Amino acid sequence: RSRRTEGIRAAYRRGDRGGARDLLEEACDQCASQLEKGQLLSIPAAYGDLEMVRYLLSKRLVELPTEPTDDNPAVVAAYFGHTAVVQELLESLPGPCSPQRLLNWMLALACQRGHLGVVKLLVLTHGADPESYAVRKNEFPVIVRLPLYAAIKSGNEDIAIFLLRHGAYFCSYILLDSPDPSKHLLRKYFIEASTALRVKWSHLRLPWVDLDWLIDISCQITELDLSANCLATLPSVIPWGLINLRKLNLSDNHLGELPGVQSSDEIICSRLLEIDISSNKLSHLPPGFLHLSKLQKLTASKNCLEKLFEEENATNWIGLRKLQELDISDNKLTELPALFLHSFKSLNSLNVSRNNLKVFPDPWACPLKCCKASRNALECLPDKMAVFWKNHLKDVDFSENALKEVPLGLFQLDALMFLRLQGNQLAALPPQEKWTCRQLKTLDLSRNQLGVLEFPAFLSESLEVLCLNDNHLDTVPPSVCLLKSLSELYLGNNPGLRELPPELGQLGNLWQLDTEDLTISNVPAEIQKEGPKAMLSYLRAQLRKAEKCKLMKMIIVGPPRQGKSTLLEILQTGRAPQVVHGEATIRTTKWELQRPAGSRAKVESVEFNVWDIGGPASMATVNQCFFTDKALYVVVWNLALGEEAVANLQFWLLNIEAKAPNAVVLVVGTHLDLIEAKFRVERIATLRAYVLALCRSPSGSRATGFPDITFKHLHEISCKSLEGQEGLRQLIFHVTCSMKDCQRLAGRLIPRSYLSLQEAVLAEQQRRSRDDDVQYLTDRQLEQLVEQTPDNDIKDYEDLQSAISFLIETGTLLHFPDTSHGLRNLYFLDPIWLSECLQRIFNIKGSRSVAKNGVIRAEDLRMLLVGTGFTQQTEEQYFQFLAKFEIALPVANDSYLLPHLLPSKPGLDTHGMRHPTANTIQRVFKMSFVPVGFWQRFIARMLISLAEMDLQLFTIYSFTGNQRNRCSTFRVKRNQTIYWQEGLLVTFDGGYLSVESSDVNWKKKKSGGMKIVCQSEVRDFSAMAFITDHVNSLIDQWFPALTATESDGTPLMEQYVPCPVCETAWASEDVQYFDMEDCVLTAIERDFISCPRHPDLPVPLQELVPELFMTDFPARLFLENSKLEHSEDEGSVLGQGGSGTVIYRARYQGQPVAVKRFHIKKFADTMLRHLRATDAMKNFSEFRQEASMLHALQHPCIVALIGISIHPLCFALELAPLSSLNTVLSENARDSSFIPLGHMLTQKIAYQIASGLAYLHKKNIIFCDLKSDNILVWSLDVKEHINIKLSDYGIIVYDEKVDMFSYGMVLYELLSGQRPALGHHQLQIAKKLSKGIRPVLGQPEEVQFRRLQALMMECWDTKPEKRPLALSVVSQMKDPTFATFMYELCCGKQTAFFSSQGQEYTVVFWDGKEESRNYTVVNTEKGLMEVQRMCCPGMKVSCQLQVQRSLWTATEDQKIYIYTLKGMCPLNTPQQALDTPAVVTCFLAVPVIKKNSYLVLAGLADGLVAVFPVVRGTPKDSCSYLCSHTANRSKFSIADEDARQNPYPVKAMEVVNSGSEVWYSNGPGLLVIDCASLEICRRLEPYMAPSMVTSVVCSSEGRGEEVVWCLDDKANSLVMYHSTTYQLCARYFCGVPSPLRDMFPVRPFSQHLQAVKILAVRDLIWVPRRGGDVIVIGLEKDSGAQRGRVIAVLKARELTPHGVLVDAAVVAKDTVVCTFENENTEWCLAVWRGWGAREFDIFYQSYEELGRL
Ligand SMILES: Nc1nc2c(ncn2[C@@H]2O[C@H](COP(=O)(O)OP(=O)(O)O)[C@@H](O)[C@H]2O)c(=O)[nH]1
C-alpha cells in the first residue's frame, strides 16, 4: 500500500516530473482519505513542485491539516525554504482562522534553518508571532523553540535583527545565554551616529542595562532613549558619568527610584538639557537635578510623587535656574514648595495639573506663558499675577478646583487670552471696571453657582467664545448681548432660564448656541426646531421692529393679444370690462385682495404690486428679464385656440422657470364664453389635462425643467359673464397665503429700516418722475437714501444687501447683477422707464447714412438718443446699461453695433471665398423654434469676439478650476468677413468658417436651425470650437428655454453631423446623419462609428467630430497609450482638480508624472444618454481650454505640460518629487521658530513665487488660488536652479491685487511656519481679513528678516492700491540688500561700544559716569538687550578685551581692571588691577598653543606696546613695554624731526601668519612684532603723514594665501600686503561715490564716503562707511594676475533715521553688526547676515541663471 509514496519519490529523484504527476494522480484516485491525501501532498512540497501543488489543491481538493507535524507539507516547505510553496499552501486554507500555531511552527523552524524569506513572508504577510513558543501537544516549552533566541543563537544576524525590529523582544535568556552577539547587535544597528551616537534602545523591553554595553562610547554619548521597558535600576554613570548627553527618555518603566551623585563635582554631564522620567513609580525626584545649571526641561509626570524634592533645605542649590518647563502633573502632590519654584527663573510653563494641591505655590517673578493647574483642590489664587506675570501669562486653567473667589489680578492679566474657571464653586466675578485682560479670546465659567455677572466693554472686540451653561442663571446676563465679536455661546442647562432676550440678536458673528434644556417663551417652538440660526434671525427681526409685510409681486404673462389687461381689469374691479387698453409694453398698478369667507389665512388681506407685461413680439426676449424669483406668475391664454395655444405655453412656462425657480405659477384660460356650454365639461377637462400633459412627466410628476404646475393651479374664466372670477381670486389668495420662503411670505417680518428704505426709494422715483430725471440709482445714491433713513440699522453693506434683496423681491427695485468693471453699480426704479428707453433705442430706424452695416457712429448715436436724458454726466451709465442688454455694443472706440440693425444678406462674392476642398467639417443645429432676436445677438457677439481676438493677436482670463470661460482655443488671424442678419462667412489664412440659417428638415422635422461649415487646410478646426462655445454661452445667458426638452422627453434643440461617406456615395436626400450625442459618447472609447447605411464601412470620428480629438494641436504633443503606465487605484491619487478631474500618480516612459484625467460618466435610456452626452461635451470643452492655456506657458516656475491623450481623456504634467510646499513647510515648522526652511532657501522660494506670478500676470493670466497647496517643491537644495513650480491643482472679482494678497499670505506662512490660523471657518476668516484683522508675526527683532516682513505686510494692506505689483517685488528681491539686512535694534543714549569674539557680551554699550556708570548687553541671536543699563560704577573706559573668563577694561586713569565673568552682572569688584604708563587705546589677545597661555598686547596712546602675559585668564605682573622709539632708533632710523615720531596712539592690532607675528599701527607706518621673541622686527609704510592706518585686518584666502588689508583714516584708501613676503600687493582708492562693480588690479557728501573700519567676513572684506553704504569686496584670478572687485553694495535705507554710522564689527561667524549714531548720541544697532563668497555667489547665480531662461 505505502509503496506508492516511494514511487513518487523515485519519480522526483530521477527528475521525472510527468511520471510523478501521473503516479500521484493515480494514488490520489486510490487515496480517498484526508490523511492519505495530506501524506501525498507532503511529497511535491518536499520536492518543491509549485505546479503539482496547484493541480493537487485545485482539482483533487486535498485538504491541508493544521497539525504542525513532520508530515505537514507547510512545515516541509518552510524547512527547505520554498517560499512560493509556503504561500500557496497557506493560501489554500479556507476561512479567516489563520493557523497561528502552524505559522509559529514554520517561523521557528525556518529561524533554526535560516530560510529568511519564509520568515519574512510569515511575519509580514501572515503575522506569525515572534514571541511565542512552538510546542506540540504533549510537549513542553523551551527557549530554543522561541524564534528570536534561536535566530541569534544560529549566528544569522540579519534574521535576528529583522525579528527584533518587527516584533521580537529581548529577555533574560538572550542576555544571559548569548551575551556577545546580543551586545554586538545592540551596539551596531541601533546607533544614530553624529562620538555623539544617539543610541535608541527603547521598546526592546530590556529587563536591565549595563554600562559595559556602551561605556566604550562614553566619550560624548552612549545612549539617550531608554524608555518602553521594565527597567528597575540604572548604572551609576547614566547620565552623570556621560559627558555630552543632552536629552534622556527614561520614562515608561519600573524605575521607581534613580541613582545619584554625592556632589556636583561628580556631574561630568553638566550640559544635559532634557529629562523625561515620567510614567514611573517615583515618590520624589532625585536631588541631583538641582545641581544641573544647564537643564532646560524636566517632565516627571505620571508618577506617585508626594514631594517635589527631598528636604535638603540646607544645600545651596544652584541647578534648574534656566528650567523653562516643569511637568509634575498626574501626581499626588499636596504642596509645591515655594523654595524651588522661586529658584526657577526661566520657567515658562508649570503643569501642576491633576494633583492634590490645595495651596497654589507662592507667586514669583518669572516669564510664565502658561499655568495648567487644573484638577486640583485649590482654595485661593495668588494675588501678584498681574504684578509678576502681567505681560507673559497667556493660557490659564484653574478649572475644576475648590475655588470660591478669584483676585482682581487674574482678570488684570494683559497677556491672558485663555481662561478656564469651570467646575468650581465661584459665586461672583470681580467688578468689570477693574479688568484689564483685553486679550480674552475664550472664557468658560460653566458649572458654577454664579449668576449679577457683568463684563467689560472692550471684551466685545476680543472675545470669541463664552460658556455660561449650567450655572445659577434664571436670566441671561444683559452684558452678554454686548459681545458683538462673540462666535460661540453656551446658555444651556439653565432650567430657570425661561426667556432668551432679544438683544442677543445684536451678536453679529454668533453662529453656535447650546440651547439644551431651555424653554424660550419669546421664541416660537418652530423657530427653535429650525435651529440656532433661525433663533438669531428671529431675534434680530424682533429687535429691529420688523413689520408684517403683506405686499407681494405678481406678473401677468402669456402670448400677445390674450386680454392680459382685461383679466387684470376684472380682477381689480370684479365687474364687466370698461377700459380701452393702449399700446404700452408694460403697465404697473396695485391691487388688494380680502380673505374669502372660510379662509384659514394668517392675514385679513393681501397686497399686490402688479406688472402687466406685453408689447410687440420684438421685445419678448428682453421682457423675460423682468421676471424675478419669489413672485406670483399668472400665465393667461385664450381657450378658443385650444391645443394650438396650449403648445405655445410651454415656451412661456420655461422662461418663467429659468428665472424664478421658486415661483408659484397659475395657468388660466379666458374666452370661456366662446366654448359651447354643453361640451365644456368634456372640452375643458380635456384641454386642462392636455396642458398638464405638456408640463408633467408620464408618471404624473413635474417634467424636469418646468415649473411645478399641478391640477389645483388651473382655472377657467370669462370676461363678459365673469364666470369664476370669484373662484380665480380665491385661488390667487389661497396660493398667495400658501406661498412660503421660514414662515409664509405674505405678512413675513421685514425689518423696519427696510420698509423705510422702500418708502424712500419710492419717494426718489416720484421725485425723478416730477423732475423728468432718469431712473438710474447708483450705489452712491442708494447709500445716500439709506443714510437719510430714520431708524437706520444699516451699518455694514451686508445689511443693505439683504435690504436690496427684499426690495427686488417686493417689486420696488430692478437689478441685473453683472460685476464686470463695476457694472453692478446700478439699480432701476421703474419698469416703464426701462422698457420705454429700450423700445426707443430699438426703434432707431437709421438709414444707410446712419447704420453702416449695423454700427452707428458714437456721436450720431449720442444725438439720436436725446429724449431720455442722455446728458454727458450720465452717458457712461446708459452704455454700461446698454452693453449689458446687448442693445448697443462698443465697436473699437469709433461706433456702436446695434444687433437689430444688421443688413440683409448682401449680394457679395460668397462663391470665390468658399473652398471646394476635402478638409470639410459640417454641423447642423435643429431647433423646434427660433427665439426672437437670437440670430442678431449670436452674430453680434461672435463678430465682437473676432474683433477682440484680432486685437489680441498684436482681457478676462483665469487659471485653475473655475466657472470663468474664455475661448483661448481660437487664436486665428481674421482675413475678411461678410456678415448679415441670418449668417456670416469669416475667412482666414488657410480656411474659413460659415454659419447660416438653414431649412433643417431631418426626418420630415421641418423646423428652424442652422448649418455650420468649417474648412482648414492645416487640420486646424478651432473654429468649430469657437462656434460651439458662442452657441452654448448665448443659449445659457439669453435663451435658457432651449436647454430643455418637451414633457415627453423630446429635445427642443438637437445637433447632428452629416455623414461624409453617404455624401461621397451620392456625390437631394436626407443624407444619413449622426446624432452628436452618440458621436461624442462613442468618441469616448472607439475610433470608428458605423453608419446605418454602411454597417460594414465604419467612418473615423477624427473626420467627423475632430474638435473632440484636438486635431489642431502639434503632433509632438500627443502621448502614446502603450507607453503610459496609468493607475486608477485609490493610492495613486495625487490630488483633485477644480473641475471634478483627478490628478493621478502615473509613469510615462519610466518617468514619474501627474496625469490630470477627466471622469465623464455619472451612471438605452434616452434621458441618461442626453445627460451623459452633455457632460461629455462640457468636459471636452474644459479639456480643450485647459490644454490650450497650458500649452502657451513656458517659464522655469510654471508646471509644464508633457503631452495629451484622448483614450482616456487625460493629459500629463511633470510630477513633484517632494509634494507641495505645504508638506515640507509644515513638517519643518514644528521644531523651529521662524524661517523653518532656512534663510537662503526661504529667499529662493519667495523669489521663485514672485517670478512665477510676474510671468503669469504678464500673460494676462490670473491665479486666484495661490496657496501653499498649489505650490510644488522639487528640491530643498539651494544650489539647484529651480526649486518650486506653480501648479494648477492642490494636494467674486479678481485682479492682480488679489493674487498679491494671496502671495503675502504665502509669505506669512513661509516666515511663521504656521498657516494664517484666523479660524477653521472660511467665512469668519474672510470677515476678519476684510475688516483689517491680520495674523500676528513677531517683531523684526525675532524674525531677523526685516525687508521681506515689510513686503509681506505691504501685500495684505486693506487698500489694493498700496499692494505692490509682481514686477516690483521681483525687482526688490533682485538686490542683495533685500536678504542681507536682518533687522535693527535701537539702544538709545550711550557713551561707548565694544564688540567681542562672540562668546559672551556679544555686543555691549556703556554710559554714565562714576556712580551712574552703567552698561547694556545685547545678544544678536535673540535681538534682545539681555542686560539693560545695569549699574557698574567707576571711571569710563576706552577699550576692553574679554577672553577665556576674564575681561580687561582700560580706564582713562592709566589702569587696566581685570574682572572675571563669574561675577555675572555686577562686575564692580575687579579680580586684578594693573597700572599703565599711559591710557591704552586698544587691545589684542593672541594665544600660544605651545605654552597654553595668551598674550594681551595693549596699544597705548603714545605708540608704545605693552605685553601682558596671561595664563588661563590670569594676568601676570611681569609685563614688558616694547618701545616704538627704541625700534626706530635701532633699525628703522627715521629722523627725529620727522612727524613719524609724534607719539601717535595705537589704533590697530592684528595677528598675522597664524599668530606668528602681530601687526599694529604707528602713524602712517605699521610695525610687526615677533610673537616668539617679542622683539619689533619690521616696519612698513602704506601711507605718509598726516595719514595713519586706522585698522589692520588679515584673513585666509581660498587658495591658502594669507594677506593683510589696511585702511587709511585720511586718504580713505585700502591697501593690501602679503603676510609672508611683506610687499604692498594692491592699492585701492575707496572714496568712490558709486562703487558699482569697481575693479582694480592686484600684483602676483564727502563725509558719507569715508570708510570707518575693515571687517573680515568669512572670505570677503566688508568696508562700511559713514553714509551707511557698505561695500563687500573680494578678489578673482585672471590669467595669473589677481583683481580685487566689489561683489555687492549694500545699504539699508531704513537705517537713515538713526543718523550716521559710528562704527561696525564682526560679532559672530555668520553675523555682522554696525552702530549708527545721531546728533543726540543715541545709537541703533543694524545687523547684516554674515555672507561669504559662497552666499553672494549662489545668490547672484540663482538670479542670473533664472534670468537666462
Ligand atoms: N369674449 C371674450 N373676449 C376676451 C376675453 N378675454 C379677452 N378678450 C378679448 O381680448 C381683447 C383684449 O386683449 P389685450 O388687452 O389687447 O391683450 P394684451 O395683448 O395682453 O394686451 C379684448 O378686445 C377682449 O374682447 C374673454 O374671456 N372673453
Residue numbers in the entry: 51 to 244, 254 to 510, 539 to 828, 835 to 1047, 1061 to 1173, 1182 to 1277, 1285 to 1412, 1439 to 1791, ...
Direct quotes from the study:
LRRK1 and LRRK2 have a similar domain organization: an N-terminal half containing Ankyrin (ANK) and Leucine Rich Repeats (LRR), and a catalytic C-terminal half containing the ROC–COR ROCO signature, followed by the kinase and a WD40 domain. Despite their shared domain architecture and involvement in intracellular trafficking, their disease associations are strikingly different: LRRK2 is involved in familial Parkinson’s disease while LRRK1 is linked to bone diseases. LRRK1 and LRRK2 use different mechanisms of autoinhibition, with LRRK1 having a second level of autoinhibition absent in LRRK2.
Our initial model for the kinase domain of LRRK1 showed density in the back pocket of the kinase that was not accounted for by the model. The density was located where Y1410 from the DYG motif would dock in the DYG ‘in’, or active, conformation. Symmetry expansion and focused refinement of the dimer dataset showed that a loop from the COR-B domain (residues 1,048–1,082), which is predicted by AlphaFold to be entirely disordered, threads into the kinase domain active site. The side chain of F1065, at the tip of the loop, sits inside the back pocket of the kinase, occupying the position of Y1410 in the DYG-in conformation. A similar ‘plugging’ of the kinase back pocket was observed in the DDR1 kinase. This suggests that the COR-B loop is an autoinhibitory element in LRRK1. We tested this by measuring Rab7a phosphorylation in 293T cells expressing either WT LRRK1 or LRRK1(F1065A), which we expected would at least partially relieve the autoinhibition.
